[PDB]
Amino acid sequence: VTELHEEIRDGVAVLTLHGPSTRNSFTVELGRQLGAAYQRLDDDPAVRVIVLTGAPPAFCSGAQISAAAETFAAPRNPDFSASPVQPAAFELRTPVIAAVNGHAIGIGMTLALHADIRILAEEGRYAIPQVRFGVAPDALAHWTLPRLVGTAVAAELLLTGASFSAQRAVETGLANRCLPAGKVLGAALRMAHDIATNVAPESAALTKRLLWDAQMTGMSAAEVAARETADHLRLMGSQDAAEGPRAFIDGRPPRWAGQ
Amino acid sequence: VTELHEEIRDGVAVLTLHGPSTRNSFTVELGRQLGAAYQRLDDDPAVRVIVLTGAPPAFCSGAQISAAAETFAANPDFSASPVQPAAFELRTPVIAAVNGHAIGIGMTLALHADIRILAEEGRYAIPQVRFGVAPDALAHWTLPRLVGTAVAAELLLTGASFSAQRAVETGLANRCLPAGKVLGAALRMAHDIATNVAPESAALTKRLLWDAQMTGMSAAEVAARETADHLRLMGSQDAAEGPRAFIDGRPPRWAGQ
Amino acid sequence: SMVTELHEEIRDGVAVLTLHGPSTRNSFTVELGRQLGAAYQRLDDDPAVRVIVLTGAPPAFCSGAQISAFSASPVQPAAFELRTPVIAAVNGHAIGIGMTLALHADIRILAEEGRYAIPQVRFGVAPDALAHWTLPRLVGTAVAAELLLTGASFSAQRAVETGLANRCLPAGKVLGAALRMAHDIATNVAPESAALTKRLLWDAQMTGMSAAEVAARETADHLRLMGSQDAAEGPRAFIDGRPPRWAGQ
Numbered sequence A: 001v002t003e004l005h006e007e008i009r010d011g012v013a014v015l016t017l018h019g020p021s022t023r024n025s026f027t028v029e030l031g032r033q034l035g036a037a038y039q040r041l042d043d044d045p046a047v048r049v050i051v052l053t054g055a056p057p058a059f060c061s062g063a064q065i066s067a068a069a070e071t072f073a074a075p076r077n078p079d080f081s082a083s084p085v086q087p088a089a090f091e092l093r094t095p096v097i098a099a100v101n102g103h104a105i106g107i108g109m110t111l112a113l114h115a116d117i118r119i120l121a122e123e124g125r126y127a128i129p130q131v132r133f134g135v136a137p138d139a140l141a142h143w144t145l146p147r148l149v150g151t152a153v154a155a156e157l158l159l160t161g162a163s164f165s166a167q168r169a170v171e172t173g174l175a176n177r178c179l180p181a182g183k184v185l186g187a188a189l190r191m192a193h194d195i196a197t198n199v200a201p202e203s204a205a206l207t208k209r210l211l212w213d214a215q216m217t218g219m220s221a222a223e224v225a226a227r228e229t230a231d232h233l234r235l236m237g238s239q240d241a242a243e244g245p246r247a248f249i250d251g252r253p254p255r256w257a258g259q
Numbered sequence B: 001v002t003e004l005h006e007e008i009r010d011g012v013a014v015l016t017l018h019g020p021s022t023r024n025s026f027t028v029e030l031g032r033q034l035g036a037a038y039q040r041l042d043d044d045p046a047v048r049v050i051v052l053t054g055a056p057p058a059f060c061s062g063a064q065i066s067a068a069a070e071t072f073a074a075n076p077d078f079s080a081s082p083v084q085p086a087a088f089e090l091r092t093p094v095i096a097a098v099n100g101h102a103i104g105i106g107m108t109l110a111l112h113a114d115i116r117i118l119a120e121e122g123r124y125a126i127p128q129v130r131f132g133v134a135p136d137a138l139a140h141w142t143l144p145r146l147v148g149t150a151v152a153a154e155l156l157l158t159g160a161s162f163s164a165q166r167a168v169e170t171g172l173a174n175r176c177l178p179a180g181k182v183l184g185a186a187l188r189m190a191h192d193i194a195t196n197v198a199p200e201s202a203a204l205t206k207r208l209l210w211d212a213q214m215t216g217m218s219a220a221e222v223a224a225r226e227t228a229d230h231l232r233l234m235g236s237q238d239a240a241e242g243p244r245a246f247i248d249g250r251p252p253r254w255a256g257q
Numbered sequence C: 001s002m003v004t005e006l007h008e009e010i011r012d013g014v015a016v017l018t019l020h021g022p023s024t025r026n027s028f029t030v031e032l033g034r035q036l037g038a039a040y041q042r043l044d045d046d047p048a049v050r051v052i053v054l055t056g057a058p059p060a061f062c063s064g065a066q067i068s069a070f071s072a073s074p075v076q077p078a079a080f081e082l083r084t085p086v087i088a089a090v091n092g093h094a095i096g097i098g099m100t101l102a103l104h105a106d107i108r109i110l111a112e113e114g115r116y117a118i119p120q121v122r123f124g125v126a127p128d129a130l131a132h133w134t135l136p137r138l139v140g141t142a143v144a145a146e147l148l149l150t151g152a153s154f155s156a157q158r159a160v161e162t163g164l165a166n167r168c169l170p171a172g173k174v175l176g177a178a179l180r181m182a183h184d185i186a187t188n189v190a191p192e193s194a195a196l197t198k199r200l201l202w203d204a205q206m207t208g209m210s211a212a213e214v215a216a217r218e219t220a221d222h223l224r225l226m227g228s229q230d231a232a233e234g235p236r237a238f239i240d241g242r243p244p245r246w247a248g249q
């Protein structure tokens, strides 16, 4: 069993993948719980940011290989899905930061690719090696990965299943930052608390949803430009648009109301 | 109020955001002037490249925070895209010589250019969400197409500052240089295009590159447009002159089309 | 009258195609393009071929089109339309269509010393072989616009830093590195796993599939693979601590 732990404090929810005996291996039940937690936390107005992390020393070692030799495609309803976490982090209004504190392999990595922002441990092993086991990348990696690193880096990681370093993840655009493992979660939390304190709630929600809706649906430039205008009318019609500059000029923290 | 200055010499037009008392702050009226200049310079056959830059020591500090209260105290034609046409809609190449600080819309408008050279000493940020508004001037569309979704999400959702070096490392900028060298490097690049790149070749290439991004053209549609553009170009004078001039090691004498 | 020749060698699951034209630094012609497209199709269809490596007769990869004093896509099918992985071992100079055809490969390994450029606009023509589409999907729109609108030379190091290339190495090491990568795929990656992964990655780019459509195909491809012997063999080999033996190989 890998459990999902949850703690909410001062506007930041931390979800921890907790399976010490298996380096937090992914399971079907863990995927069900993670999707349910994403939805509930997204809906909770008190939650400004979600941080996803693993019980040290790993983030998520992915599918249990020794336990996956006879996972036949049995006919059933509901059927199997290659997207075992729904909703995906990129479907939420709430920003999601993956504090990848150690090894992230297979679906451990492809689920981390759903987050807006990734901070990776320098000491971690990272790979998407599904094709070396006779299956294929999952959880939308065929779509998320080229949108980070371009098609060549994506093809190399998906077609060879090769391991890559935290440093190469930053160099190629997969990850935002790399740090020693013991510093990763703290950096993610500092970033999360800065969003919770200093970024307006509706500003974050509309910006995240336009960024990702445009990717998900293939919006044209004209369609994105029109939605920025419509989102601006929504934001400028709320007092938070006056509070941001007022608080800055006063030298005080903003008192966000949201809408 | 920041003015727009314009100088055209030897096929290169330089537009300067000139507001020395405010780090070249942006206003809607400046945006209107910039869009109008883009359109006129695009239509001017003598202009091969447009370079956009700021009066030192800044590129453009964006919307003044100090001016926000007056704005929200007071338009049916409001747009989050206050510069139209965008640089990426033109036939004419646009280089942003980002000679210093570029903040907010100062940065998002710079993202419209084909090429960015950034000052190593500059402060760069898109901090709109920290002020209760959101990224503007198509940043939700231009930025992931430069740096990928993760760097884009970090810059847009946190509003954090970033260095010129990080801009180059991630794909936002083409080059970084000390501030006082940025404009000169942009001008050398602009004059190389004006001298050595055929006018219709630049126009068709820029428009296919950007039209395909703007409208999500399929690979098949892009391939068909390349074929059409080639048939247009191969039957023109400049397709003969380019190789002829190269074989002589002389500057080409372009006619355009 | 000699031409750039297309040579082919298949050994241990890896096909090497060589652009062999040392008299012209392996220049490209429409006829070479026809031969390359035909070889890509045949090798894709050959079950014995796990990976195709494209390379040039030293010291060049491909000097591009001849200059003098119909389709802009002269290689069909393109490498990215195949089921079979394609690695371009860009062992030297790749200019013009020499570079834009290299951009069709899944993976590029570039010689550190080589000159690279897409200089068509400097010759009164324009980028070709889908460079307007492949290039921004590697390096972003700014690096793409710079390379296409200036036509200027760029380095292998810059190619790796921007995402155009996967690795850069001294010229004399490039083919060896591509072959080691190819043989690792042939040995350690299941055939249908590579085919479906390649086709979904590229089809989604070619036709602008929505995220929902990509997710649905991942599920359908997983159902296909879970119904295949290689999905049993991968875990079984791992548990045994032995190399996998893929079906029909």
Ligand SMILES: [K+]
Pocket: A041, A042, A043, A044, A045, A046, A047, A048, A094
């Ligand atoms: K929430």
Ligand SMILES: [K+]
Pocket: B041, B042, B043, B044, B045, B046, B047, B048, B092
């Ligand atoms: K013009």
Ligand SMILES: [K+]
Pocket: C043, C044, C045, C046, C047, C048, C049, C050, C084
């Ligand atoms: K084959």
Ligand SMILES: [K+]
Pocket: A171, A172, A173, B169, B170, B171, C161, C162, C163
């Ligand atoms: K990069």
